Amino acid sequence: KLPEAYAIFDPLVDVLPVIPVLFLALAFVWQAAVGFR
Amino acid sequence: SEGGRIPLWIVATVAGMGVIVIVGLFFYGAYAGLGSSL
Amino acid sequence: DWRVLVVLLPVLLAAGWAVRNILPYAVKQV
Amino acid sequence: TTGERPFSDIITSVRYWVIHSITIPALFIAGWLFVSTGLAYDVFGTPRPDSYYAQEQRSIPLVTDRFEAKQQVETFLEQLK
Amino acid sequence: METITYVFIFACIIALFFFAIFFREPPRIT
Amino acid sequence: RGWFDILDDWLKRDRFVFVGWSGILLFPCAYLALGGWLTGTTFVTSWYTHGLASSYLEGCNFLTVAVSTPANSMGHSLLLLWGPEAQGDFTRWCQLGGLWTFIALHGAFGLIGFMLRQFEIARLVGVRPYNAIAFSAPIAVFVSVFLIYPLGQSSWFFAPSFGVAAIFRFLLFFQGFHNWTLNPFHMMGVAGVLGGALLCAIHGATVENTLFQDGEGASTFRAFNPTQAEETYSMVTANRFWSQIFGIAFSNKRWLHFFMLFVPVTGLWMSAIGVVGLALNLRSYDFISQEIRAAEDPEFETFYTKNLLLNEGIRAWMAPQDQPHENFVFPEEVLPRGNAL
Amino acid sequence: SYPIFTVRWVAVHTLAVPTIFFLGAIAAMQFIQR
Amino acid sequence: ATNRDQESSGFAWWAGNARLINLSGKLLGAHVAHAGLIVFWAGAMTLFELAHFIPEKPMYEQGLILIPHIATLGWGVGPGGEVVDTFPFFVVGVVHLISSAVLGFGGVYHAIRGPETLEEYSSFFGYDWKDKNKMTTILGFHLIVLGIGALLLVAKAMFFGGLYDTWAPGGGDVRVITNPTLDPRVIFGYLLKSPFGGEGWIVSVNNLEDVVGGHIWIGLICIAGGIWHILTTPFGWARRAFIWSGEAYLSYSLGALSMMGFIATCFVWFNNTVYPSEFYGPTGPEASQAQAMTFLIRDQKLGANVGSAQGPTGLGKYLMRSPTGEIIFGGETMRFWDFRGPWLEPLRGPNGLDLNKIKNDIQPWQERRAAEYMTHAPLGSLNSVGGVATEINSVNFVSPRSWLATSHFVLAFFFLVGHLWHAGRARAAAAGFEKGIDRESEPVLSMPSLD
Amino acid sequence: ANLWERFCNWVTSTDNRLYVGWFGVIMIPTLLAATICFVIAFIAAPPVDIDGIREPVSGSLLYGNNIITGAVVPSSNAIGLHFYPIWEAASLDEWLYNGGPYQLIIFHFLLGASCYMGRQWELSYRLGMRPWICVAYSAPLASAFAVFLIYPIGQGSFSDGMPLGISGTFNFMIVFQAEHNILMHPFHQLGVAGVFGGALFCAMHGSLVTSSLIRETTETESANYGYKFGQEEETYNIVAAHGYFGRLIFQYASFNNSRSLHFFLAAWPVVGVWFAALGISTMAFNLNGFNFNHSVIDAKGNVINTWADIINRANLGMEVMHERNAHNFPLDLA
Amino acid sequence: VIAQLTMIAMIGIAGPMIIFLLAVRRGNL
Ligand code: CLA
Ligand code: CLA
Ligand code: CLA
Ligand code: CLA
Ligand code: CLA
Ligand SMILES: CC1=C(/C=C/C(C)=C/C=C/C(C)=C/C=C/C=C(C)/C=C/C=C(C)/C=C/C2=C(C)CCCC2(C)C)C(C)(C)CCC1
Ligand SMILES: CC1=C(/C=C/C(C)=C/C=C/C(C)=C/C=C/C=C(C)/C=C/C=C(C)/C=C/C2=C(C)CCCC2(C)C)C(C)(C)CCC1
Ligand SMILES: CC1=C(/C=C/C(C)=C/C=C/C(C)=C/C=C/C=C(C)/C=C/C=C(C)/C=C/C2=C(C)CCCC2(C)C)C(C)(C)CCC1
Ligand SMILES: CC1=C(/C=C/C(C)=C/C=C/C(C)=C/C=C/C=C(C)/C=C/C=C(C)/C=C/C2=C(C)CCCC2(C)C)C(C)(C)CCC1
Ligand code: OEX
Ligand SMILES: [Ca+2]
Ligand SMILES: [Ca+2]
Ligand SMILES: [Cl-]
Ligand SMILES: [Cl-]
Ligand SMILES: [Fe+2]
Ligand SMILES: [Mg+2]
Structure with missing residues (x-):
């Protein structure tokens, strides 16, 4: 477990490792926004 | 109303996120309730 | 069976709604 | 083209979403309730978790007679008291 | 006889590889 | 220009989804087979036919849901909703496995519908009907596996059930009981499918790697025009490459593409013939010489005898739950087992 | 300039309507407990 | 918007990063941002692991792959590999996560704000791929960096607590390495061992002295080599042997990483010295x-x-x-x-x-x-049901050795594929037929027939 | 020119009936050695103690096998992953008893086939072609590696490598299903999508091009004579083929672009088979198929079987019967 | 279990939000 002080951020911590994946998806959002030119 | 008013990329992004959400829910169900083996 | 009405109330409310919204164009088409 | 309106046009039109932001959730909720009210079980004859076996039974209610199969299933269901 | 048959069919096939490759009808451009 | 011809006019309109006369058979039957499969796998049990849960409603996932075959006691009943078994009761009909025959039959007629569609569109567009002809292999496979095979056996029960894991079970059953991998018709099937895959791969890759430079782009897809007269890749270079690599090469494009039709279509047809044999338990199960030698000589061992031991395990360990109507009780002491396991 | 209720429209909806209903159901099922 | 569509760049959106080949600034951006991604996952994943960590359960019962790496380094553990203090894990995580913000900052800056090319801005940071001197120089810098890293391992092992030694007399324990193996006969001895059974090549290293000494050697070798490549330019035979282009260099590195991935797969599958079984199972x-x-x-x-x-x-x-x-x-x-x-x-x-x-x-x-x-x-299912494939549900377990080995086999494979792709393409582009065959100058048409 | 220069020119010559090349310089002797050893062994090798329990299995024709049952038998479990070349045996008789031929053949073959891939790159380079045919070939090659090398490494013995024979192949498959539930593994499922799909698209493409052949012949001659090798004109009307297929489904489901289409034809089976190879290669380290054994449970706690549980019973039969004298302890851990 | 979903909603929107803001402000996408 995290030190007690940080425990309130447990949900956030559970979600962080997936963020890199989001970047991949972001690349596509971005491309769709410029029409895949 | 007129077509093209809502950007196709927004529609695609939102639709896609919706799919990820519902599929996410189904995988959640693999671990809870019926079919969880528990 | 009340369950079939509680369940198929959304479907018929949807059908009624879209019928309401598309009625003029439908009449124009027909 | 074949005369129909392009899908790109339709799904990016405001009216389409006025219609379907109602009709899609309505359908979704309808199916949801089809399950949550338990109606699905009764329409399709699917056992609830407490209706596969009577309390001390451990024998599958296998249908074994072709022409009185219906009655066999009915008997099996009565056997759950 | 069985072994002889198996090995014979195999041998004919290898011979066939040889002719199909080195004694093929040459492709010709028109 | 009477009503028949007016109807023909409308059926053959160039719309987004072509209808045709064949559409009248195809669309309802395909729709009912797909819908039946989705309905069944979402909501319907197999408790009363197999002693199995098989729906999302019961807790199964995509891999384990199925629309399962009827009980063995139903024999080969058409199992119509209005038939003497269900007698018009939709719920009982579902419980008795009515959806299985519903899906298999609407599916069969749907496949007829689709192939008719292929003929009709080919005729309307002015092409040769080789696509329909090729579709005869899917037909042969469906009809031999889902109709002929169970019709040869005791009942619809031993047909494949419509589901992922259910099909996997069908495979394992065929290994254990029929020694299906030993069958030369299945082997020809495998040669046709793997050979088909090989041709798909090698042809696609060859075309893509003998392309003429027909544009300035480093991404070369745009440098093609459907209306262009010229071959888009070099057949001569392709021919020399494969001649020097493999020893032989296509030189004739027409033959190449006919061959691509021929291999997988023929493979599937052969597999069909094998399954028609398995309908009667007419198996390629054993090699008699092998068995005579092995029976007399306890040191004689081959991979064939090894696999039969595996089959015997499969049969003994799967039969009681897989065939519940037989009421098999195999005491522990009779179960075949090697040391320790 | 374009029609609304076409053969395509029908086809589309014969698939899409049941699909959304079904997805609602399967969603509900994820919260069923034995 | 320079080079950001197919018409101007020659590359479709799905090969869009190929538009970056001669834009050193933006490319710098892409790389630093990616490094940011890597560091980010290290930190975030560590914090995730730590939050989910029950100290009296074996690590390998808890789906951990990073905390075992930290623990092997001597941080946080005692005799038998028992967790005595989680705080070092916390530090490793937090510090990586904080650093990824910096890297991402620099990456985003160079990628969409800074000079798109670096050559007009700086002769030091600018480069031409065909400039063999500059390429070997940058290669040199990074070799020096790698050597420094290996030496950081050495320093941890010898002067800052030591390493976890599963072979420690009296039982596994953290031990300071004081007499690292310096004898080249032993060190490169490992390099000349068969990869087959009972030999295992470098995967067979079975004591920390050999590991530490190996990293001393590798550190000096990398620093020396780096200086060497800063101070020299490729010799003639090298010039004639290689393709000199961005895609070529990428292909070479892809081959290298494929090889390393396979090696790591075997390492985590067989070795229980640098992958202690206390932590990895x-x-x-x-x-x-x-x-x-x-x-x-x-x-x-x-x-x-x-x-x-x-x-x-x-x-x-x-x-x-x-x-x-x-x-x-x-x-x-x-x-x-x-x-x-x-x-x-x-x-x-x-x-x-x-x-x-x-x-x-x-x-x-x-x-x-x-x-x-x-x-x-290390047997278990994809949904983490521990045991043989016929086992019933009950135990939630797949060994970290399985996770690591399988993941890195997949990655090594696709990186071999990537090597073939980019090597073949680099050859074709350098020779000038990557876009297809010139119809008016089709090479085979000028060759004598085979028969 | 000097002798070495001449030699290089010949090796890399574009005019040899079969291209040699530098990869070919390794390929030719290794493939020859693998081939020769394989043929001799398949005909005449004595029984081999595959599972290291002094229970020799007969693979060759002269020792009681036919084409279907015969095999070159994997090396002994006693050897494990040890390198067992001919010169490690005290004699050819020992060598044969312990399955030496298997190791000689698969190592020479894996090297030779790798060089075959390289050689595909090389000739593509000499002919002024684009280079990626070899990438397509990497898929069957990777599969070969999976079953002859990687799976043995993971399981700790070449005795678990795929046998060089038909029935032996089936043996490998069934034991694999027992020990990994490969049918429930998504990479194998992708592999099936790869070869079923490859077959589908093979037939589909074949039939579509054949359907749109431009008329160039009479009814008493083969339509194939309507195409002449090296002609510049395409031999079929792709607009007509697309008109057809686009109408068969709907228009935007069909390829109007031949390059795009052929790329698809290459990519689908290649990627699928890549995943098949990776499936074998990762089940090599016992990350197995989905296990839903007893996943569905009723309100009391009674197990409600699904088709997964029936699969499990079949697998149990395979498991308990395979290598019936080799296990002394209750868990089959490799 | 609410906060996890809230967080991933905020992060998950943070991505598309940048694109949207820039598209609106006619920025250098
Ligand atoms: C790790 C993955 C990665 C990285 C680092 C990059 C990086 C890059 N890409 Mg590539 N790309 C990728 C994956 C990636 N790409 C993928 C998966 C695809 C297929 C979808 C592409 C397809 C593609 C094409 C077709 C093109 C690029 C281009 C580029 C470059 C310019 C981008 C630009 O100007 O857009 C402008 C974008 C915006 C203005 C929107 C905002 C973008 C920023 C970076 C978002 C940052 C979010 C982050 C959380 C902020 C943290 C802040 C904090 C640190 C303070 C840039 C160096 C272009 C190029 O090469 O130009 C020369 C180009 O044309 N990419
Ligand atoms: C350091 C590693 C590395 C680098 C820097 C590059 C760089 C490049 N590659 Mg190469 N490549 C690599 C490894 C690498 N590659 C590997 C390992 C393979 C084997 C698969 C390839 C196979 C390959 C091909 C076939 C091609 C390239 C191309 C390129 C160029 C354009 C890339 C692009 O814009 O894609 C944009 C990115 C995308 C479109 C994203 C693809 C989506 C992937 C497949 C998703 C993977 C799934 C994910 C891991 C898990 C699921 C996540 C999901 C659920 C969210 C660029 C120079 C192109 C080229 O030739 O340019 C000259 C090209 O055609 N690469
Ligand atoms: C080196 C890579 C690696 C390895 C070995 C592991 C291993 C593990 N992770 Mg970690 N993790 C990783 C990367 C890795 N992860 C990444 C990139 C993320 C961000 C997404 C995470 C975030 C994460 C979380 C949040 C959790 C884990 C957990 C775990 C454990 C359970 C894994 C599981 O059930 O997977 C399930 C298996 C899959 C989902 C299958 C993935 C198959 C991929 C998609 C195939 C890709 C093929 C190829 C790349 C595609 C190329 C395309 C081709 C055409 C070229 C296991 C120890 C769990 C745990 O127990 O923590 C304590 C957990 O909760 N991981
Ligand atoms: C790592 C690769 C890398 C490279 C090659 C560059 C190169 C460059 N940067 Mg960039 N940048 C980077 C990363 C990098 N940066 C990072 C991580 C950030 C976030 C802080 C930035 C943010 C940034 C900004 C805001 C600007 C630049 C600018 C520049 C240019 C001027 C450099 C200079 O004169 O500094 C002089 C050198 C020093 C003052 C000495 C630096 C002392 C270092 C940092 C101590 C630490 C060293 C140690 C090895 C760090 C290890 C980190 C590692 C563990 C991850 C040059 C092209 C400028 C530019 O492009 O102008 C147009 C500019 O304005 N960079
Ligand atoms: C990132 C690491 C790296 C890279 C990419 C390079 C790259 C290069 N080096 Mg450099 N070098 C390095 C690190 C590196 N070096 C280090 C650490 C040192 C100090 C040891 C050197 C010392 C050095 C010298 C003295 C020279 C180079 C040279 C070169 C250039 C040609 C090398 C070549 O043809 O290799 C290909 C390798 C060969 C041709 C070797 C023979 C081929 C056999 C068959 C390889 C078999 C290996 C086997 C597969 C590996 C398995 C394990 C093995 C131990 C059994 C090339 C630019 C040459 C140059 O041009 O300098 C200006 C040169 O003369 N390097
Ligand atoms: C039977 C019957 C019938 C019929 C009915 C019907 C016709 C129905 C239909 C139904 C339907 C029609 C349904 C549907 C459904 C759907 C669904 C349920 C879906 C889902 C999906 C998903 C889940 C997705 C997934 C995915 C994929 C696929 C890929 C991509 C990714 C993802 C993951 C997203 C009648 C009455 C006549 C009579 C009686 C009997
Ligand atoms: C270029 C480009 C791209 C990419 C990008 C990228 C890749 C980026 C990255 C970025 C990054 C990489 C970022 C990062 C960030 C980070 C951060 C921002 C962090 C923060 C942290 C914090 C705040 C912490 C906190 C804490 C503490 C301190 C303690 C413990 C707990 C906690 C965790 C709470 C794309 C593809 C889109 C496209 C366009 C171009
Ligand atoms: C740390 C450590 C250690 C050590 C290590 C070492 C010391 C290593 C070294 C290593 C090395 C020392 C490596 C090397 C490598 C190399 C390579 C990998 C090579 C490559 C090459 C190539 C690739 C080439 C190619 C070619 C050819 C062949 C022909 C001509 C052309 C070309 C050039 C392309 C030990 C184990 C003790 C322990 C543990 C720790
Ligand atoms: C560490 C940390 C942090 C950081 C964060 C971050 C760094 C974030 C980022 C984020 C992001 C970066 C996000 C993104 C997202 C994305 C998305 C959500 C996307 C999606 C997509 C999709 C859905 C797609 C779709 C599509 C299209 C568009 C087209 C094509 C088709 C498809 C359908 C595929 C904070 C601040 C919290 C603080 C604490 C700690
Ligand atoms: O060797 Mn061929 O098979 Ca792979 O598990 Mn263990 O070991 Mn044997 O038993 Mn099961
Ligand atoms: Ca309960
Ligand atoms: Ca230099
Ligand atoms: Cl066996
Ligand atoms: Cl044992
Ligand atoms: Fe073709
Ligand atoms: Mg559930």
């Missing part, structure tokens, strides 16, 4: 051996003479000979006799497993360890 060999040990112990307790017990095949039920005569565990695990582990080695004599030691010297901790490892063998 037993190896496959180890668990199989442990089963043999376990039932030898059970049956011998029951009165069995395990040395003379003839099995059904005629081979020893518990004990048999290897093809060179050593006494080894019987049953299928005969394949795994090259296994070596701190819990088994006390039973080993000069001729292999010692019957007297087996009869009189087996300790309770050995029974325990063998039982633990036998019952945590």
